[PDB]
């Protein structure tokens, strides 16, 4: 069942989905936890939260945007996290086989990709640390043509 | 067998190799295994490499020299010294309830913001390496101090070498 | 008073000012201190105003 | 229970000891003067206006150079597939630079060359015409 | 004569011929036209399946190539990486740039006495073969190290 | 099988301190250069732009070290333009020096304008096919 | 037999001579024939003369020194070096579908128009020699570059000798 909610202003919210919903919510949400196990799709426009924990299992599509102080992401297989436009301060991201992540860390980024999974970032954080295990990969995937791109420092420069 | 870069972050099946070279006796292989997976031989192996261990009360501390476990003036981790890091994971596997603090320290040469930023980067790199080996995110915290509280004298060469370090503290409860 | 941005989506944007006042802006609307908005860019964090100046991310 | 303290390095030479003690004092003298000077005259402009970036200015390089400016600027421009142009007369006393970096982009290399050139020469980049331009100062 | 050097140090013609022959039998292509030199390496002998992570055993090959590069005298080296078409243009442009960055760093860590090393990654833009059926097993996913011998 | 260490690595507790001091000194040099350098914005840079007429794209080859008027008149004559002078020639003439092998005339004109400095200027009108050398009062 | 100036542009019946001196064994004559008409011995014969062969991908290139295959500063073809030219025809006979590009290069001494005109003349002479041996006119193209893109340094003697050359490139499809 499709769902189209326009306008939510809550100071707490907890969502768990089990079947195949197609939900999209607008407003201002202080979300706390998210667990996905089906062919569910979800999108939220603005969230001003403090700590997110995401666990995605089978084939789920998530589309968030907003401000997050601390982010923890787990993708298991065939799962896609479209966390572009979600600007996070701390990120911990772990991906298993054939999963896709889009990351926008600002201050601190910590990532691990294990086997044939992909992490793409889209911002240059102040401290970056990435690890690769079997065939996974973390790629830059920025523009190359913007007039004011900024390069690495002594403190960002890690070699994948 | 064993993959030398971190074994793809998998726990290495170490005991079966000893019991295969000794069955290829079973009792002698079990005695050799139960000796080398004990805590005191792991502590002696960190003693054999350049890592110091201090136990006082119910607080435990590891001291790690950046001179051998990082590349020069960078937050990149030195890949030739992987036995020490694997032994650190093996020793830390024995306390699955405690919380961990990792702190980074440099010497006095340079500017203050430079020292603070380099310490913060190195502490985060070692915390990320700990987190990627299985330890949950709610058990960890990293902090970088500059030349804040030194343990040797910075006006002499060897003491200044001894001042650049990583501290790992953890509790029991 | 100067204004910053917080998060950018294709179509709308969320902004913060110096005073801590949040704001939501359309493709075309009026904000005080800059004027009229004619372009919201999604790939690049930049929004042009009618007074010829651009509003971008924080540093 | 043998006792040991962690940093055990290779043996040191007392010549290297004496050079290190001189170099540390040079470094913090340098720090104080740069702090004083930054406080007295705060800078206002940046050469990002004169050297913007472009596509295929994002190839990377590591460099160790200790000579005159023109040949290095020509090599960087030829690697970036740009035309190279010189304006003004080269002076009789040559303009020397010394760059020792590792893995940074050509736009930053050009900006560091521009910063080290000082009052003697300048770098401009025109991306619509794909031109790197070096101009000498009207002095002497 | 006893105090001037008699040759460029650590270099021998027999050693150059020996290592060039051994590299050509191993499978790395070494070619020379005039004074320009090209070393071409298949990506399968260095990387994992399209990730910028080296295997542990390919560092012996990079050590062998560095021992070859120390025999000459030179000013600039160019390292360029090319791959095969998987997802978009951006993903392999990023992949080839990362691969070239890592390889040129290890070569710079070893003692090649060059003044400039340039690195670029061209993606899957310039194929040398119309047979595009493999993945990373394809012959046109490669890294090429080119230079000119100076004097 | 093998990873070798870097060949010139600071593996010595005196060399490490020497290398850290060498890093910080160069950081301070970069800071000093950034404070000390004065730049102009590219909007108000007073140099003649490329006038992109068709006749001024022809390649040339020039060796000259002398007064500015004769060389500019020859450049004008080679481009089938007209040439006119506005001002008064000083007692000591304006001396330039051009030495190139294969370069276009519009950019030769740009170098003439850059080397002339504050004493003279070059204007190009590409509708009435003329170039103009204007002196400084 | 064989007529030394180009055999009147006829294909020489080469195999029958070997099988006549060996029947004058038939099997040994066939093995000697099937060895020497193979591609690798022809490639080694061009290696034995002063002609270089480079294969990379599906593009193939021949490098020919004008110093031995032309008379001095003229578009006339040097008739003493006809074995190399015959071997070039024999090797080029193996790829009957591809298109051919021939390019001519000189060094830096002289004037620009002189260098361009001499390069154009030499490239046309070698293209005409290729066309007269059977190759159709729609498969060929000649171009003369001056000192445009050199392969060695022109300020030294041996590299300048190595810069004067004829390049032959061809594809597979």
JSON list of N, CA and C in Angstrom, two decimals, chain D residues 81-137:
[
{"chain": "D", "resi": 81, "resn": "UNK", "atom": "N", "xyz": [47.38, 19.63, -20.78]},
{"chain": "D", "resi": 81, "resn": "UNK", "atom": "CA", "xyz": [46.89, 19.82, -22.16]},
{"chain": "D", "resi": 81, "resn": "UNK", "atom": "C", "xyz": [46.46, 21.26, -22.41]},
{"chain": "D", "resi": 82, "resn": "UNK", "atom": "N", "xyz": [47.20, 22.20, -21.87]},
{"chain": "D", "resi": 82, "resn": "UNK", "atom": "CA", "xyz": [46.90, 23.61, -22.02]},
{"chain": "D", "resi": 82, "resn": "UNK", "atom": "C", "xyz": [48.01, 24.27, -22.81]},
{"chain": "D", "resi": 83, "resn": "UNK", "atom": "N", "xyz": [47.70, 25.40, -23.42]},
{"chain": "D", "resi": 83, "resn": "UNK", "atom": "CA", "xyz": [48.75, 26.19, -24.04]},
{"chain": "D", "resi": 83, "resn": "UNK", "atom": "C", "xyz": [49.50, 26.98, -22.98]},
{"chain": "D", "resi": 84, "resn": "UNK", "atom": "N", "xyz": [50.76, 27.28, -23.26]},
{"chain": "D", "resi": 84, "resn": "UNK", "atom": "CA", "xyz": [51.63, 27.99, -22.34]},
{"chain": "D", "resi": 84, "resn": "UNK", "atom": "C", "xyz": [52.06, 29.33, -22.91]},
{"chain": "D", "resi": 85, "resn": "UNK", "atom": "N", "xyz": [51.97, 30.37, -22.10]},
{"chain": "D", "resi": 85, "resn": "UNK", "atom": "CA", "xyz": [52.26, 31.73, -22.53]},
{"chain": "D", "resi": 85, "resn": "UNK", "atom": "C", "xyz": [53.12, 32.47, -21.53]},
{"chain": "D", "resi": 86, "resn": "UNK", "atom": "N", "xyz": [54.04, 33.30, -22.04]},
{"chain": "D", "resi": 86, "resn": "UNK", "atom": "CA", "xyz": [54.95, 34.07, -21.22]},
{"chain": "D", "resi": 86, "resn": "UNK", "atom": "C", "xyz": [54.80, 35.54, -21.58]},
{"chain": "D", "resi": 87, "resn": "UNK", "atom": "N", "xyz": [54.68, 36.39, -20.56]},
{"chain": "D", "resi": 87, "resn": "UNK", "atom": "CA", "xyz": [54.58, 37.83, -20.73]},
{"chain": "D", "resi": 87, "resn": "UNK", "atom": "C", "xyz": [55.66, 38.54, -19.93]},
{"chain": "D", "resi": 88, "resn": "UNK", "atom": "N", "xyz": [56.24, 39.56, -20.54]},
{"chain": "D", "resi": 88, "resn": "UNK", "atom": "CA", "xyz": [57.31, 40.31, -19.93]},
{"chain": "D", "resi": 88, "resn": "UNK", "atom": "C", "xyz": [58.66, 39.69, -20.24]},
{"chain": "D", "resi": 89, "resn": "UNK", "atom": "N", "xyz": [59.69, 40.38, -19.80]},
{"chain": "D", "resi": 89, "resn": "UNK", "atom": "CA", "xyz": [61.06, 39.92, -19.95]},
{"chain": "D", "resi": 89, "resn": "UNK", "atom": "C", "xyz": [61.49, 39.16, -18.71]},
{"chain": "D", "resi": 90, "resn": "UNK", "atom": "N", "xyz": [62.16, 38.04, -18.93]},
{"chain": "D", "resi": 90, "resn": "UNK", "atom": "CA", "xyz": [62.75, 37.33, -17.80]},
{"chain": "D", "resi": 90, "resn": "UNK", "atom": "C", "xyz": [63.91, 38.13, -17.24]},
{"chain": "D", "resi": 91, "resn": "UNK", "atom": "N", "xyz": [64.07, 38.17, -15.92]},
{"chain": "D", "resi": 91, "resn": "UNK", "atom": "CA", "xyz": [65.14, 38.97, -15.35]},
{"chain": "D", "resi": 91, "resn": "UNK", "atom": "C", "xyz": [66.46, 38.24, -15.49]},
{"chain": "D", "resi": 92, "resn": "UNK", "atom": "N", "xyz": [67.54, 38.99, -15.28]},
{"chain": "D", "resi": 92, "resn": "UNK", "atom": "CA", "xyz": [68.88, 38.43, -15.41]},
{"chain": "D", "resi": 92, "resn": "UNK", "atom": "C", "xyz": [69.23, 37.54, -14.24]},
{"chain": "D", "resi": 93, "resn": "UNK", "atom": "N", "xyz": [68.86, 37.94, -13.04]},
{"chain": "D", "resi": 93, "resn": "UNK", "atom": "CA", "xyz": [68.95, 37.04, -11.90]},
{"chain": "D", "resi": 93, "resn": "UNK", "atom": "C", "xyz": [67.72, 36.17, -11.92]},
{"chain": "D", "resi": 94, "resn": "UNK", "atom": "N", "xyz": [67.87, 34.85, -12.05]},
{"chain": "D", "resi": 94, "resn": "UNK", "atom": "CA", "xyz": [66.71, 34.00, -12.29]},
{"chain": "D", "resi": 94, "resn": "UNK", "atom": "C", "xyz": [65.83, 33.85, -11.07]},
{"chain": "D", "resi": 95, "resn": "UNK", "atom": "N", "xyz": [64.57, 33.56, -11.34]},
{"chain": "D", "resi": 95, "resn": "UNK", "atom": "CA", "xyz": [63.59, 33.31, -10.29]},
{"chain": "D", "resi": 95, "resn": "UNK", "atom": "C", "xyz": [63.59, 31.82, -9.96]},
{"chain": "D", "resi": 96, "resn": "UNK", "atom": "N", "xyz": [64.08, 31.45, -8.78]},
{"chain": "D", "resi": 96, "resn": "UNK", "atom": "CA", "xyz": [64.19, 30.06, -8.37]},
{"chain": "D", "resi": 96, "resn": "UNK", "atom": "C", "xyz": [63.11, 29.68, -7.38]},
{"chain": "D", "resi": 97, "resn": "UNK", "atom": "N", "xyz": [62.61, 28.46, -7.55]},
{"chain": "D", "resi": 97, "resn": "UNK", "atom": "CA", "xyz": [61.59, 27.87, -6.69]},
{"chain": "D", "resi": 97, "resn": "UNK", "atom": "C", "xyz": [62.12, 26.52, -6.21]},
{"chain": "D", "resi": 98, "resn": "UNK", "atom": "N", "xyz": [61.49, 25.97, -5.17]},
{"chain": "D", "resi": 98, "resn": "UNK", "atom": "CA", "xyz": [61.84, 24.68, -4.58]},
{"chain": "D", "resi": 98, "resn": "UNK", "atom": "C", "xyz": [60.57, 24.08, -4.03]},
{"chain": "D", "resi": 99, "resn": "UNK", "atom": "N", "xyz": [60.08, 23.02, -4.67]},
{"chain": "D", "resi": 99, "resn": "UNK", "atom": "CA", "xyz": [58.81, 22.39, -4.33]},
{"chain": "D", "resi": 99, "resn": "UNK", "atom": "C", "xyz": [59.10, 20.94, -3.96]},
{"chain": "D", "resi": 100, "resn": "UNK", "atom": "N", "xyz": [58.57, 20.49, -2.82]},
{"chain": "D", "resi": 100, "resn": "UNK", "atom": "CA", "xyz": [58.71, 19.08, -2.43]},
{"chain": "D", "resi": 100, "resn": "UNK", "atom": "C", "xyz": [57.41, 18.65, -1.77]},
{"chain": "D", "resi": 101, "resn": "UNK", "atom": "N", "xyz": [56.50, 18.15, -2.58]},
{"chain": "D", "resi": 101, "resn": "UNK", "atom": "CA", "xyz": [55.19, 17.70, -2.12]},
{"chain": "D", "resi": 101, "resn": "UNK", "atom": "C", "xyz": [54.93, 16.26, -2.55]},
{"chain": "D", "resi": 102, "resn": "UNK", "atom": "N", "xyz": [53.70, 15.80, -2.31]},
{"chain": "D", "resi": 102, "resn": "UNK", "atom": "CA", "xyz": [53.32, 14.44, -2.65]},
{"chain": "D", "resi": 102, "resn": "UNK", "atom": "C", "xyz": [51.81, 14.38, -2.82]},
{"chain": "D", "resi": 103, "resn": "UNK", "atom": "N", "xyz": [51.36, 14.05, -4.04]},
{"chain": "D", "resi": 103, "resn": "UNK", "atom": "CA", "xyz": [49.97, 13.74, -4.39]},
{"chain": "D", "resi": 103, "resn": "UNK", "atom": "C", "xyz": [49.02, 14.91, -4.10]},
{"chain": "D", "resi": 104, "resn": "UNK", "atom": "N", "xyz": [49.17, 15.95, -4.88]},
{"chain": "D", "resi": 104, "resn": "UNK", "atom": "CA", "xyz": [48.16, 16.98, -4.80]},
{"chain": "D", "resi": 104, "resn": "UNK", "atom": "C", "xyz": [47.87, 17.43, -6.22]},
{"chain": "D", "resi": 105, "resn": "UNK", "atom": "N", "xyz": [46.74, 18.11, -6.39]},
{"chain": "D", "resi": 105, "resn": "UNK", "atom": "CA", "xyz": [46.26, 18.40, -7.73]},
{"chain": "D", "resi": 105, "resn": "UNK", "atom": "C", "xyz": [47.04, 19.53, -8.38]},
{"chain": "D", "resi": 106, "resn": "UNK", "atom": "N", "xyz": [46.94, 19.60, -9.71]},
{"chain": "D", "resi": 106, "resn": "UNK", "atom": "CA", "xyz": [47.73, 20.55, -10.48]},
{"chain": "D", "resi": 106, "resn": "UNK", "atom": "C", "xyz": [47.31, 21.98, -10.19]},
{"chain": "D", "resi": 107, "resn": "UNK", "atom": "N", "xyz": [46.03, 22.19, -9.86]},
{"chain": "D", "resi": 107, "resn": "UNK", "atom": "CA", "xyz": [45.61, 23.53, -9.48]},
{"chain": "D", "resi": 107, "resn": "UNK", "atom": "C", "xyz": [46.30, 23.97, -8.19]},
{"chain": "D", "resi": 108, "resn": "UNK", "atom": "N", "xyz": [46.43, 23.06, -7.23]},
{"chain": "D", "resi": 108, "resn": "UNK", "atom": "CA", "xyz": [47.16, 23.40, -6.01]},
{"chain": "D", "resi": 108, "resn": "UNK", "atom": "C", "xyz": [48.65, 23.56, -6.25]},
{"chain": "D", "resi": 109, "resn": "UNK", "atom": "N", "xyz": [49.22, 22.76, -7.16]},
{"chain": "D", "resi": 109, "resn": "UNK", "atom": "CA", "xyz": [50.63, 22.94, -7.52]},
{"chain": "D", "resi": 109, "resn": "UNK", "atom": "C", "xyz": [50.85, 24.32, -8.11]},
{"chain": "D", "resi": 110, "resn": "UNK", "atom": "N", "xyz": [49.96, 24.74, -9.01]},
{"chain": "D", "resi": 110, "resn": "UNK", "atom": "CA", "xyz": [50.08, 26.05, -9.62]},
{"chain": "D", "resi": 110, "resn": "UNK", "atom": "C", "xyz": [49.90, 27.15, -8.58]},
{"chain": "D", "resi": 111, "resn": "UNK", "atom": "N", "xyz": [49.01, 26.93, -7.61]},
{"chain": "D", "resi": 111, "resn": "UNK", "atom": "CA", "xyz": [48.81, 27.93, -6.57]},
{"chain": "D", "resi": 111, "resn": "UNK", "atom": "C", "xyz": [50.01, 28.03, -5.64]},
{"chain": "D", "resi": 112, "resn": "UNK", "atom": "N", "xyz": [50.67, 26.91, -5.33]},
{"chain": "D", "resi": 112, "resn": "UNK", "atom": "CA", "xyz": [51.88, 26.98, -4.51]},
{"chain": "D", "resi": 112, "resn": "UNK", "atom": "C", "xyz": [53.02, 27.65, -5.26]},
{"chain": "D", "resi": 113, "resn": "UNK", "atom": "N", "xyz": [53.15, 27.39, -6.56]},
{"chain": "D", "resi": 113, "resn": "UNK", "atom": "CA", "xyz": [54.16, 28.09, -7.36]},
{"chain": "D", "resi": 113, "resn": "UNK", "atom": "C", "xyz": [53.88, 29.58, -7.37]},
{"chain": "D", "resi": 114, "resn": "UNK", "atom": "N", "xyz": [52.61, 29.94, -7.46]},
{"chain": "D", "resi": 114, "resn": "UNK", "atom": "CA", "xyz": [52.20, 31.33, -7.45]},
{"chain": "D", "resi": 114, "resn": "UNK", "atom": "C", "xyz": [52.52, 31.98, -6.11]},
{"chain": "D", "resi": 115, "resn": "UNK", "atom": "N", "xyz": [52.34, 31.24, -5.02]},
{"chain": "D", "resi": 115, "resn": "UNK", "atom": "CA", "xyz": [52.60, 31.80, -3.70]},
{"chain": "D", "resi": 115, "resn": "UNK", "atom": "C", "xyz": [54.09, 32.00, -3.46]},
{"chain": "D", "resi": 116, "resn": "UNK", "atom": "N", "xyz": [54.89, 31.04, -3.89]},
{"chain": "D", "resi": 116, "resn": "UNK", "atom": "CA", "xyz": [56.34, 31.12, -3.74]},
{"chain": "D", "resi": 116, "resn": "UNK", "atom": "C", "xyz": [57.00, 32.10, -4.69]},
{"chain": "D", "resi": 117, "resn": "UNK", "atom": "N", "xyz": [56.35, 32.43, -5.81]},
{"chain": "D", "resi": 117, "resn": "UNK", "atom": "CA", "xyz": [56.95, 33.39, -6.73]},
{"chain": "D", "resi": 117, "resn": "UNK", "atom": "C", "xyz": [57.03, 34.77, -6.12]},
{"chain": "D", "resi": 118, "resn": "UNK", "atom": "N", "xyz": [56.05, 35.14, -5.32]},
{"chain": "D", "resi": 118, "resn": "UNK", "atom": "CA", "xyz": [56.19, 36.34, -4.52]},
{"chain": "D", "resi": 118, "resn": "UNK", "atom": "C", "xyz": [55.93, 37.58, -5.32]},
{"chain": "D", "resi": 119, "resn": "UNK", "atom": "N", "xyz": [56.87, 38.52, -5.23]},
{"chain": "D", "resi": 119, "resn": "UNK", "atom": "CA", "xyz": [56.76, 39.79, -5.90]},
{"chain": "D", "resi": 119, "resn": "UNK", "atom": "C", "xyz": [57.35, 39.78, -7.30]},
{"chain": "D", "resi": 120, "resn": "UNK", "atom": "N", "xyz": [57.84, 38.64, -7.77]},
{"chain": "D", "resi": 120, "resn": "UNK", "atom": "CA", "xyz": [58.58, 38.57, -9.03]},
{"chain": "D", "resi": 120, "resn": "UNK", "atom": "C", "xyz": [57.77, 38.08, -10.22]},
{"chain": "D", "resi": 121, "resn": "UNK", "atom": "N", "xyz": [56.82, 37.17, -10.02]},
{"chain": "D", "resi": 121, "resn": "UNK", "atom": "CA", "xyz": [56.09, 36.61, -11.14]},
{"chain": "D", "resi": 121, "resn": "UNK", "atom": "C", "xyz": [54.69, 36.22, -10.70]},
{"chain": "D", "resi": 122, "resn": "UNK", "atom": "N", "xyz": [53.83, 36.00, -11.68]},
{"chain": "D", "resi": 122, "resn": "UNK", "atom": "CA", "xyz": [52.45, 35.63, -11.39]},
{"chain": "D", "resi": 122, "resn": "UNK", "atom": "C", "xyz": [51.94, 34.59, -12.38]},
{"chain": "D", "resi": 123, "resn": "UNK", "atom": "N", "xyz": [50.97, 33.80, -11.92]},
{"chain": "D", "resi": 123, "resn": "UNK", "atom": "CA", "xyz": [50.32, 32.74, -12.68]},
{"chain": "D", "resi": 123, "resn": "UNK", "atom": "C", "xyz": [48.86, 33.11, -12.89]},
{"chain": "D", "resi": 124, "resn": "UNK", "atom": "N", "xyz": [48.40, 33.02, -14.13]},
{"chain": "D", "resi": 124, "resn": "UNK", "atom": "CA", "xyz": [46.98, 33.17, -14.43]},
{"chain": "D", "resi": 124, "resn": "UNK", "atom": "C", "xyz": [46.53, 31.99, -15.28]},
{"chain": "D", "resi": 125, "resn": "UNK", "atom": "N", "xyz": [45.27, 31.61, -15.12]},
{"chain": "D", "resi": 125, "resn": "UNK", "atom": "CA", "xyz": [44.71, 30.48, -15.85]},
{"chain": "D", "resi": 125, "resn": "UNK", "atom": "C", "xyz": [43.40, 30.91, -16.48]},
{"chain": "D", "resi": 126, "resn": "UNK", "atom": "N", "xyz": [43.27, 30.70, -17.79]},
{"chain": "D", "resi": 126, "resn": "UNK", "atom": "CA", "xyz": [42.04, 30.98, -18.51]},
{"chain": "D", "resi": 126, "resn": "UNK", "atom": "C", "xyz": [41.48, 29.67, -19.01]},
{"chain": "D", "resi": 127, "resn": "UNK", "atom": "N", "xyz": [40.44, 29.13, -18.38]},
{"chain": "D", "resi": 127, "resn": "UNK", "atom": "CA", "xyz": [39.96, 27.79, -18.73]},
{"chain": "D", "resi": 127, "resn": "UNK", "atom": "C", "xyz": [39.13, 27.75, -19.99]},
{"chain": "D", "resi": 128, "resn": "UNK", "atom": "N", "xyz": [38.51, 28.86, -20.36]},
{"chain": "D", "resi": 128, "resn": "UNK", "atom": "CA", "xyz": [37.71, 28.88, -21.57]},
{"chain": "D", "resi": 128, "resn": "UNK", "atom": "C", "xyz": [38.58, 28.86, -22.82]},
{"chain": "D", "resi": 129, "resn": "UNK", "atom": "N", "xyz": [39.79, 29.38, -22.73]},
{"chain": "D", "resi": 129, "resn": "UNK", "atom": "CA", "xyz": [40.75, 29.32, -23.82]},
{"chain": "D", "resi": 129, "resn": "UNK", "atom": "C", "xyz": [41.80, 28.24, -23.59]},
{"chain": "D", "resi": 130, "resn": "UNK", "atom": "N", "xyz": [41.81, 27.61, -22.41]},
{"chain": "D", "resi": 130, "resn": "UNK", "atom": "CA", "xyz": [42.74, 26.54, -22.02]},
{"chain": "D", "resi": 130, "resn": "UNK", "atom": "C", "xyz": [44.19, 27.03, -22.08]},
{"chain": "D", "resi": 131, "resn": "UNK", "atom": "N", "xyz": [44.44, 28.09, -21.32]},
{"chain": "D", "resi": 131, "resn": "UNK", "atom": "CA", "xyz": [45.71, 28.78, -21.33]},
{"chain": "D", "resi": 131, "resn": "UNK", "atom": "C", "xyz": [46.28, 28.94, -19.92]},
{"chain": "D", "resi": 132, "resn": "UNK", "atom": "N", "xyz": [47.54, 28.56, -19.74]},
{"chain": "D", "resi": 132, "resn": "UNK", "atom": "CA", "xyz": [48.32, 28.91, -18.56]},
{"chain": "D", "resi": 132, "resn": "UNK", "atom": "C", "xyz": [49.28, 30.02, -18.93]},
{"chain": "D", "resi": 133, "resn": "UNK", "atom": "N", "xyz": [49.29, 31.10, -18.14]},
{"chain": "D", "resi": 133, "resn": "UNK", "atom": "CA", "xyz": [50.01, 32.32, -18.47]},
{"chain": "D", "resi": 133, "resn": "UNK", "atom": "C", "xyz": [50.91, 32.70, -17.30]},
{"chain": "D", "resi": 134, "resn": "UNK", "atom": "N", "xyz": [52.20, 32.90, -17.57]},
{"chain": "D", "resi": 134, "resn": "UNK", "atom": "CA", "xyz": [53.16, 33.37, -16.59]},
{"chain": "D", "resi": 134, "resn": "UNK", "atom": "C", "xyz": [53.61, 34.77, -16.96]},
{"chain": "D", "resi": 135, "resn": "UNK", "atom": "N", "xyz": [53.46, 35.72, -16.04]},
{"chain": "D", "resi": 135, "resn": "UNK", "atom": "CA", "xyz": [53.89, 37.09, -16.32]},
{"chain": "D", "resi": 135, "resn": "UNK", "atom": "C", "xyz": [54.90, 37.59, -15.30]},
{"chain": "D", "resi": 136, "resn": "UNK", "atom": "N", "xyz": [55.95, 38.23, -15.79]},
{"chain": "D", "resi": 136, "resn": "UNK", "atom": "CA", "xyz": [57.00, 38.77, -14.94]},
{"chain": "D", "resi": 136, "resn": "UNK", "atom": "C", "xyz": [56.72, 40.19, -14.49]},
{"chain": "D", "resi": 137, "resn": "UNK", "atom": "N", "xyz": [57.32, 40.56, -13.36]},
{"chain": "D", "resi": 137, "resn": "UNK", "atom": "CA", "xyz": [57.05, 41.85, -12.76]},
{"chain": "D", "resi": 137, "resn": "UNK", "atom": "C", "xyz": [57.87, 42.93, -13.46]}
]
